[PDB]
Amino acid sequence: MDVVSLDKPFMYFEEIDNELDYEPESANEVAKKLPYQGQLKLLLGELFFLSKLQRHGILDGATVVYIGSAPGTHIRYLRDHFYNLGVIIKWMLIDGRHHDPILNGLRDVTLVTRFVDEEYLRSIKKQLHPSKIILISDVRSPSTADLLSNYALQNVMISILNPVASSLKWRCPFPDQWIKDFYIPHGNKMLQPFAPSYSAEMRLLSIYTGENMRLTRVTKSDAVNYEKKMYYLNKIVRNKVVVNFDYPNQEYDYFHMYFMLRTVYCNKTFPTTKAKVLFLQQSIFRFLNIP
Amino acid sequence: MDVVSLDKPFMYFEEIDNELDYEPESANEVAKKLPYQGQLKLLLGELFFLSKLQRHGILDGATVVYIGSAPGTHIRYLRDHFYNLGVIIKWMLIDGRHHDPILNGLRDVTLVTRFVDEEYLRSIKKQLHPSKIILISDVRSPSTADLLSNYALQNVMISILNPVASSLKWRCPFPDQWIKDFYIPHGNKMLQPFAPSYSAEMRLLSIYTGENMRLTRVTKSDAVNYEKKMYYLNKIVRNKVVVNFDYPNQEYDYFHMYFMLRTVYCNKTFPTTKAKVLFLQQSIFRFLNIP
Ligand SMILES: Nc1ncnc2c1ncn2[C@@H]1O[C@H](CSCC[C@H](N)C(=O)O)[C@@H](O)[C@H]1O
Ligand SMILES: Nc1ncnc2c1ncn2[C@@H]1O[C@H](CSCC[C@H](N)C(=O)O)[C@@H](O)[C@H]1O
Ligand SMILES: C[n+]1c(N)cc[nH]c1=O
Ligand SMILES: C[n+]1c(N)cc[nH]c1=O
């Protein structure tokens, strides 16, 4: 067995303290181990992000604009969670594909069937005005060309929507497929437990203070770094059993999940963090039909 | 006569401490009082900016890429000034119009006859590599549509060229001609002595630290503010005679010029700042053929 002792998991990209030459053979390996693992991956990250905004007092009264929301099964859990906590939030879910019918019939959630373009963004901004907007983007076209285009669309979402905060899908193009340097919003590169086995994808989390917008350039050397750091995380770290992690499941991803869940707020009071987390996890897995 | 006592002039936009409702009638008033006033306006601002970079040790060894450089008569003075000071700089002047022939025959200055587009910017960047680039932009198409387009081109200059510093032409669209909010690089809004009588134009000066790029949104309310602050500056301030300004010319613009010139470095040592400034001014006016 692959056992180890860890104080805390790698929460953000910058924390990864080692790297490994990427082995293309890893692409042929089992990408997922749990049913609806993708819904779980998203639910944890979005719960983490939104709980932070709550902590900073910027969630209540906002409209969450989620672009690339379909099917969005897990979004129903998110909605119920904050709705039951007493937080007042309107949800606007936009995607050209159809949403899970469990999202229908809720006065607080609007489902829109539209692929957004710059022009459309302008009209929703005018229509949402004067509400404060929290943006969540999970759009997907892939080629580096598709990526750059998705990233360019994401930056235009922020400029036009002018959100108080945002969570954006972020996966750096692979070095051997570099095209050109580009900019992405400045934010924390949140790491994702339950991401596919060898996924280099993370979520860019940003909070907008003032009327400024900070961006950061991304170069091929950065792309080389992302590949090696993420490969080391996937191949070595995520394959560890944290034996000093007293929890029903000691695998790295549950240890990582634990740390995200411990930040989440609840109505019910627990005698320990372990009690809260086990409850949240149980609740999440049951909702998603994960054994 | 319109007399007053001033400690220092308004150096940057933020310093303007009052505002006045814009009177459209002012557009019919004499815009310029000195021959080649436009060359003088540019020469002072660019000398100010470049002396700052020298002060910060980032000028020597750079290539100044000036886009919208033609005719560029005043650029010959700038070049001679730093060339005689011992600073090693290469100049690359690009414009689709022809440059003043006084710029020819200098190994350190390259004249290019080309209207730059994003594609061209990429090729010059690849060709200038690995030199550090200082960008100066004075491109002009006008309508708010022309402006936005010029500003969008300027942001692309910075992203592609990735300069260590930049000086950009900056005039906010007029409120009654607003189209949409937009972003411009973060920088100091340098005020310009000898700008046309009622001009609302300034120069955005930026120094790039790290691999970040900070932008700032500009709204119609900001456009309303620019109009009133600049109108107050033009109508009231610039029309003042600074009687406690012991100098051959006590008009506001000479008082303002004085402060810019006092920052400029020289080979010759002077017993007073007044002596240095009078010398620099004399030298500048003689070069430009201004009585
Ligand atoms: N311009 C655009 N506007 C809206 N949705 C877009 C888009 N481009 C792509 N998409 C959507 O991006 C989605 C990627 S998969 C998204 C999964 C979803 N976040 C979940 O929770 O299940 C697809 O449904 C696709 O239709
Ligand atoms: N894309 C572009 N590339 C280069 N020059 C451009 C341009 N668009 C406009 N211009 C130039 O912008 C200039 C505006 S006037 C510039 C005056 C010059 N800075 C001086 O010192 O005299 C014109 O010469 C025009 O040809
Ligand atoms: C995950 N990954 C791939 N799938 C291909 C290249 N490099 C990489 O890190
Ligand atoms: C200078 N100016 C104009 N020329 C027109 C409108 N508002 C303004 O400040």
Ligand 3 pocket member A172 (CB < 6 A): no
Encoded tokens for A169: 């899908």
User: Does the beta-carbon distance from A213 to B216 stay under 8 Å?
Assistant: yes
The span from the CA of A216 to the CA of A226, in Å, is 15
CATH for A67? 3.40.50.150
Numbered residues of chain A with Cβ closer than 8 Å to any chain B Cβ = 122, 159, 162, 180-181, 183, 186, 211-217, 219
Residue B286 to residue B74: CA distance in whole angstroms: 12
- Matching residue, tokens 């020819």: B104
Query: Residue A202 — left, alpha, or beta (φ > 0 → left; ψ -120 to 50 → alpha)?
Result: beta
Instruction: Provide the domain count of chain B.
Output: 1
Residue type, B109: V
Give the whole-angstrom CA distance, residue A15 versus residue A17. Answer: 6
Cis peptide before B185 (omega within 30 of 0): no
Q: Which amino acid is at B134?
A: I
Residues of A forming the annotated binding site for mRNA? 22, 171-174, 176, 199-201, 227
When CB atoms are compared, the residue of A159, A214, A219 closest to B212 is A214
Q: Are A262 and A209 in contact (CB under 8 A)?
A: no
Q: Is B33 in the pocket of ligand 2 (CB under 6 A)?
A: no
Neighbours of A223 (CB within 10 A): 19
Count CB neighbours of A8 within 10 A: 10
Q: How far is the CA of B38 from the centre of ligand 2 (A)?
A: 13
Distance in Å, CA B192 to ligand 2 centroid: 18
* Element holding B171 (H helix, E strand): none
Residue A139 makes CB contacts below 8 A (sequence gap 6+) with: A67, A68, A150, A153, A154, A169
Edge-first strand order for the sheet with A182-185 is: A182-185, A212-218, B212-218, B182-185
Answer yes or no: are the C-beta atoms of B151 and B184 closer than 8 Å: yes
- This structure's resolution (Å) is 2.0
Give the separation between CA B153 and CA B159, rounded to whole angstroms.
Answer: 10
The CB-based long-range contact list for B184-188 (8 Å cut-off, 24+ gap) reads: B184/B151, B184/B154, B184/B155, B184/B215, B184/B216, B184/B218, B185/B154, B185/B155, B185/B158, B185/B213, B185/B214, B185/B215, B185/B216, B186/A212, B186/B214, B186/B215, B186/B216, B188/B12
Ligand 4 atom nearest to CA at B234: 1
Look at ligand 2, atom 24, and give the residue with the nearest C-alpha.
B70
Tokens at A190, concatenated:
């949140």
Domain hosting residue A132, numbered range: 1-291
Query: Is the CB of residue B179 less than 8 Å from the CB of residue B145?
Result: yes
Class of residue B24 by CB neighbours under 10 A (exposed 0-12, middle 13-18, buried 19+): exposed
Tokens of A12: 């953000």
| Cα distances (Å, whole numbers) of residue A16 to A233, B15, B221 | 7, 45, 44
The beta-strand segments (E) located in A157-201 are: 165-170, 182-185, 188-190
Residue A161 CB neighbour total at 10 angstroms: 20
- Residue B140 contacts residue B201 (beta carbons within 8 Å): no
Please identify every residue of B annotated as catalytic: 169
Structure tokens at B150: 């010029």
Distinct helix (H) and strand (E) counts, chain B: 7, 11
Whether residue A213 and residue B214 make contact (CB cut-off 8 A), yes or no, is: yes
- Residue ranges in chain A assigned as alpha helix (H): 37-55, 73-84, 118-128, 144-161, 220-235, 252-261, 273-288
Which chain B residue is nearest to residue A161, measuring alpha carbons?
A: B181
Which of chain B's residues have a Cβ under 8 Å away from the Cβ of A219?
Answer: 211
- Reduce the DSSP state of residue B172 to 3 states and report it: coil
Phi, psi of A140 (to 5 degrees): -145, 135
